[PDB]
Write an enzyme that holds these catalytic residues in place. Structure first.
Site, PDB file in Angstrom:
ATOM      1  N   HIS A  26     -55.800 -43.294  -0.469  1.00 16.69           N
ATOM      2  CA  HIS A  26     -56.612 -42.998   0.666  1.00 16.69           C
ATOM      3  C   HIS A  26     -57.171 -44.327   1.157  1.00 16.69           C
ATOM      4  O   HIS A  26     -57.534 -45.174   0.351  1.00 16.69           O
ATOM      5  CB  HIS A  26     -57.788 -42.131   0.253  1.00 16.69           C
ATOM      6  CG  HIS A  26     -58.544 -42.671  -0.911  1.00 16.69           C
ATOM      7  ND1 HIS A  26     -59.604 -43.530  -0.774  1.00 16.69           N
ATOM      8  CD2 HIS A  26     -58.382 -42.498  -2.239  1.00 16.69           C
ATOM      9  CE1 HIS A  26     -60.070 -43.866  -1.963  1.00 16.69           C
ATOM     10  NE2 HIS A  26     -59.341 -43.254  -2.873  1.00 16.69           N
ATOM     11  N   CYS A  33     -16.467 -36.882 -14.947  1.00 15.27           N
ATOM     12  CA  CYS A  33     -16.161 -37.182 -13.537  1.00 15.27           C
ATOM     13  C   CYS A  33     -14.810 -37.847 -13.349  1.00 15.27           C
ATOM     14  O   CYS A  33     -14.556 -38.892 -13.929  1.00 15.27           O
ATOM     15  CB  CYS A  33     -17.187 -38.107 -12.945  1.00 15.27           C
ATOM     16  SG  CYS A  33     -16.866 -38.350 -11.188  1.00 15.27           S
ATOM     17  N   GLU A  77     -57.998 -37.009  -7.939  1.00 10.28           N
ATOM     18  CA  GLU A  77     -58.322 -38.132  -8.803  1.00 10.28           C
ATOM     19  C   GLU A  77     -58.821 -37.616 -10.111  1.00 10.28           C
ATOM     20  O   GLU A  77     -59.310 -36.499 -10.186  1.00 10.28           O
ATOM     21  CB  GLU A  77     -59.413 -39.033  -8.155  1.00 10.28           C
ATOM     22  CG  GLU A  77     -59.831 -40.270  -8.946  1.00 10.28           C
ATOM     23  CD  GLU A  77     -58.694 -41.266  -9.297  1.00 10.28           C
ATOM     24  OE1 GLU A  77     -57.612 -40.896  -9.876  1.00 10.28           O
ATOM     25  OE2 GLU A  77     -58.916 -42.459  -8.997  1.00 10.28           O
ATOM     26  N   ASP A  96     -26.271 -44.001 -27.168  1.00 11.95           N
ATOM     27  CA  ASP A  96     -25.594 -44.199 -25.929  1.00 11.95           C
ATOM     28  C   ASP A  96     -24.307 -44.982 -26.215  1.00 11.95           C
ATOM     29  O   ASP A  96     -24.323 -46.219 -26.343  1.00 11.95           O
ATOM     30  CB  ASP A  96     -26.523 -44.957 -24.966  1.00 11.95           C
ATOM     31  CG  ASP A  96     -25.854 -45.348 -23.686  1.00 11.95           C
ATOM     32  OD1 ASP A  96     -24.785 -44.785 -23.377  1.00 11.95           O
ATOM     33  OD2 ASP A  96     -26.389 -46.248 -23.002  1.00 11.95           O
TER      34      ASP A  96
HETATM   35  C1  LIG Z   1     -27.886 -36.083 -11.057  1.00  9.75           C
HETATM   36  C2  LIG Z   1     -27.259 -35.986 -12.449  1.00  9.75           C
HETATM   37  C3  LIG Z   1     -27.550 -34.981 -13.273  1.00  9.75           C
HETATM   38  O1  LIG Z   1     -26.867 -35.162 -14.394  1.00  9.75           O
HETATM   39  C4  LIG Z   1     -26.121 -36.388 -14.213  1.00  9.75           C
HETATM   40  C5  LIG Z   1     -25.282 -37.010 -15.027  1.00  9.75           C
HETATM   41  C6  LIG Z   1     -24.655 -38.175 -14.624  1.00  9.75           C
HETATM   42  C7  LIG Z   1     -24.945 -38.702 -13.377  1.00  9.75           C
HETATM   43  C8  LIG Z   1     -24.319 -39.890 -12.933  1.00  9.75           C
HETATM   44  C9  LIG Z   1     -25.076 -40.940 -12.458  1.00  9.75           C
HETATM   45  C10 LIG Z   1     -24.479 -42.095 -11.968  1.00  9.75           C
HETATM   46  N1  LIG Z   1     -25.298 -43.070 -11.531  1.00  9.75           N
HETATM   47  C11 LIG Z   1     -24.864 -44.311 -11.621  1.00  9.75           C
HETATM   48  C12 LIG Z   1     -24.039 -44.733 -12.657  1.00  9.75           C
HETATM   49  N2  LIG Z   1     -23.590 -46.056 -12.720  1.00  9.75           N
HETATM   50  C13 LIG Z   1     -23.981 -46.940 -11.726  1.00  9.75           C
HETATM   51  C14 LIG Z   1     -24.791 -46.509 -10.691  1.00  9.75           C
HETATM   52  C15 LIG Z   1     -25.259 -45.198 -10.638  1.00  9.75           C
HETATM   53  S1  LIG Z   1     -26.261 -44.701  -9.273  1.00  9.75           S
HETATM   54  C16 LIG Z   1     -25.278 -43.519  -8.388  1.00  9.75           C
HETATM   55  O2  LIG Z   1     -26.458 -45.878  -8.340  1.00  9.75           O
HETATM   56  O3  LIG Z   1     -27.660 -44.220  -9.652  1.00  9.75           O
HETATM   57  C17 LIG Z   1     -23.071 -42.203 -11.965  1.00  9.75           C
HETATM   58  C18 LIG Z   1     -22.317 -41.125 -12.434  1.00  9.75           C
HETATM   59  N3  LIG Z   1     -20.983 -41.194 -12.440  1.00  9.75           N
HETATM   60  C19 LIG Z   1     -20.188 -40.152 -12.916  1.00  9.75           C
HETATM   61  C20 LIG Z   1     -20.791 -38.996 -13.387  1.00  9.75           C
HETATM   62  N4  LIG Z   1     -22.179 -38.931 -13.375  1.00  9.75           N
HETATM   63  C21 LIG Z   1     -22.923 -39.977 -12.913  1.00  9.75           C
HETATM   64  C22 LIG Z   1     -25.828 -37.990 -12.545  1.00  9.75           C
HETATM   65  C23 LIG Z   1     -26.395 -36.862 -12.987  1.00  9.75           C
HETATM   66  O1  LIG Z   2     -59.660 -45.615 -14.264  1.00  8.03           O
HETATM   67  P1  LIG Z   2     -60.633 -46.450 -13.443  1.00  8.03           P
HETATM   68  O2  LIG Z   2     -60.277 -47.942 -13.430  1.00  8.03           O
HETATM   69  O3  LIG Z   2     -62.136 -46.226 -13.612  1.00  8.03           O
HETATM   70  O4  LIG Z   2     -60.280 -45.974 -11.940  1.00  8.03           O
HETATM   71  C1  LIG Z   2     -60.503 -44.633 -11.528  1.00  8.03           C
HETATM   72  C2  LIG Z   2     -61.594 -44.632 -10.494  1.00  8.03           C
HETATM   73  O5  LIG Z   2     -61.061 -45.192  -9.296  1.00  8.03           O
HETATM   74  C3  LIG Z   2     -61.578 -44.508  -8.139  1.00  8.03           C
HETATM   75  O6  LIG Z   2     -60.503 -43.822  -7.437  1.00  8.03           O
HETATM   76  C4  LIG Z   2     -62.175 -45.521  -7.138  1.00  8.03           C
HETATM   77  O7  LIG Z   2     -63.258 -46.276  -7.703  1.00  8.03           O
HETATM   78  C5  LIG Z   2     -62.620 -43.524  -8.728  1.00  8.03           C
HETATM   79  O8  LIG Z   2     -62.775 -42.359  -7.938  1.00  8.03           O
HETATM   80  C6  LIG Z   2     -62.122 -43.245 -10.130  1.00  8.03           C
HETATM   81  O9  LIG Z   2     -63.151 -42.836 -11.033  1.00  8.03           O
END
Ligand SMILES: Cc1coc2ccc(-c3cc(Nc4cnccc4S(C)(=O)=O)cc4nccnc34)cc12
Ligand SMILES: O=P(O)(O)OC[C@H]1O[C@](O)(CO)[C@@H](O)[C@@H]1O
Length: 430
Positions: free
Chosen positions: A237, A138, A306, A108
């Site tokens: 639920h 952009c 689940e 990056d």
């Molecule tokens: C959806 C999507 C698909 O492919 C992307 C690539 C870049 C971005 C993207 C995301 C983005 N988000 C972002 C960047 N910096 C600060 C805040 C944000 S945000 C909008 O609050 O999530 C900003 C961008 N600015 C210029 C060009 N692309 C931006 C979005 C997408």
């Molecule tokens: O992964 P753990 O902690 O056993 O939790 C999953 C369990 O939780 C529940 O949703 C509720 O007890 C069960 O149906 C399920 O087996």
């Protein structure tokens, strides 16, 4: 001649090439937003992935940021430092992919020059890594300005300078990269690279030579995400009859308390005052009864059902310890990978929840009413929690988890709706 492994129940006989993802673009084009989000998705689906942000290497190597002058193309000395930070990041990429079992390394940085990208290619080629390029383009001042306000001015580079000065410094910083910026040219000089050029915040894409499944999956993911404001609500639920008996799985109905929760959830949703809230349930009765109280249209998904406990379905944890003592212990020892016999693991859950996550990304306001283990799996995705942690995240009954995408993360607020229930949380053992 075969034996079944104790944890995952896999029959074994008894006596893949790693990828460097290269971000490309001017500053404040969402490279890091994309890096982070992608890395979250990839890790949650079980592809180990790590971000190497050159900026952070530069921050570590140099005292404290004073100004955009550091980024000047005539700054012969900052250029040497920048390039050395890059090479050090790559050194770590090599180590991560070749020796630490990393699968995907996201590099990056701006990487705006052909020359820089050529060096990265050479590094990948000579380590047998594939290279995949993602460029964000952009030229809309509003978007850029907003990006700077949202994440840049608040960065540590800018602690001593705030707001107007930071915004001002960042604009000049950007302009330092403009003269030498060479966009990916799939038409000609880049026709042989694997890349995606994303234009205007995901409005359009240019995709060239997808080599393998990870890359087509990344593209698909990028085509499904969006940056519109919205809210995601997750809950279980209402308490059900099996919860009252300490019994796992099954398809029981709501207890009287569960129904009080449903009425309360209805009240809560109404008061949130959302437009176009989609509601998703499992196919199990308790989630559907809960949604019935809302008086909203909802849609059921078998994928939200689940975790399947197999032969242990409808048993108490006590009954499981008495009847299948070794199965009990193995689950407490390795809770993410453990499969119940003829049933599922948390790992299996992630696989069938993947299309839920992908549709969640496409949606705006959504309420998901589900079950304990399913909820943890989804929560882990949004909160970037690891596989080892996922099975122990806390998701109490009668409590709404309200998630708000922010840039680079997710705000989570818990809202307990004041209806008693039993507790089904079981903490890590021994
Ligand atoms: C959806 C999507 C698909 O492919 C992307 C690539 C870049 C971005 C993207 C995301 C983005 N988000 C972002 C960047 N910096 C600060 C805040 C944000 S945000 C909008 O609050 O999530 C900003 C961008 N600015 C210029 C060009 N692309 C931006 C979005 C997408
Ligand atoms: O992964 P753990 O902690 O056993 O939790 C999953 C369990 O939780 C529940 O949703 C509720 O007890 C069960 O149906 C399920 O087996």
């Amino acid at each position: 001649e075969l034996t079944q492994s104790r944890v995952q129940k896999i029959w074994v006989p008894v006596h893949n090439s790693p990828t460097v993802i290269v971000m490309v673009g001017l500053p404040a084009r969402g490279k890091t937003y994309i890096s982070k989000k992608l890395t979250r998705y990839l890790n949650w689906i079980g592809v180990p992935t790590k971000v190497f942000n050159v900026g952070e290497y530069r921050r570590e190597a140099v005292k404290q940021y004073s100004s955009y002058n550091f980024f000047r193309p005539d700054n012969e000395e900052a250029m040497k430092v920048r390039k050395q930070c890059a090479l050090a990041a790559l050194r770590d990429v090599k180590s991560y992919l070749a020796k630490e079992g990393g699968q995907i390394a996201v590099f990056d940085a701006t990487n705006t020059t052909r020359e820089r990208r050529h060096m990265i290619l050479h590094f990948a080629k000579e380590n047998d890594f594939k290279a995949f390029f993602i460029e964000s383009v952009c030229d809309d001042p509003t978007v850029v300005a907003s990006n700077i306000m949202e994440v840049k001015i608040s960065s540590p580079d800018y602690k001593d300078c705030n707001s107007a000065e930071a915004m001002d410094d960042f604009m000049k910083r950007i302009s330092c990269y403009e003269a030498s910026y060479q966009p990916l040219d799939p038409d000609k000089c880049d026709r042989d690279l694997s890349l995606i050029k994303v234009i205007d915040v995901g409005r359009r894409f240019l995709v060239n030579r997808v080599q393998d499944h990870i890359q087509s999956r990344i593209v698909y993911y990028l085509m499904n995400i969006h940056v519109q404001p919205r809210t995601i609500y997750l809950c279980r639920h209402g308490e059900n009859e099996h919860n009252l008996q300490g019994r796992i799985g099954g398809d029981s109905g709501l207890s009287s308390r569960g129904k009080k929760f449903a009425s309360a959830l209805s009240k809560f949703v109404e008061e949130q005052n959302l437009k176009d809230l989609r509601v998703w349930t499992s196919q199990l009765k308790s989630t559907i009864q809960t949604a019935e109280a809302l008086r909203l249209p909802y849609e059921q998904w078998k994928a939200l059902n689940e975790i399947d406990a197999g032969v242990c379905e409808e048993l108490t944890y006590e009954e499981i310890r008495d009847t299948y003592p070794e199965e009990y212990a193995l689950r407490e020892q390795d809770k993410y990978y453990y499969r119940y016999p003829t049933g599922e693991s948390y790992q299996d859950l992630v696989q069938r929840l993947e299309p839920v996550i992908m549709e969640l990304e496409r949606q705006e306001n959504v309420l998901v009413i589900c079950h304990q283990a399913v909820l943890r799996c989804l929560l882990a995705y949004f909160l970037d929690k690891s596989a080892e942690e996922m099975p122990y995240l806390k998701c109490p009954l009668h409590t709404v988890l309200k998630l708000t995408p922010v840039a680079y993360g997710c705000r989570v607020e818990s809202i307990y709706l004041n209806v008693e229930s039993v507790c089904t949380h079981r903490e890590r053992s021994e």
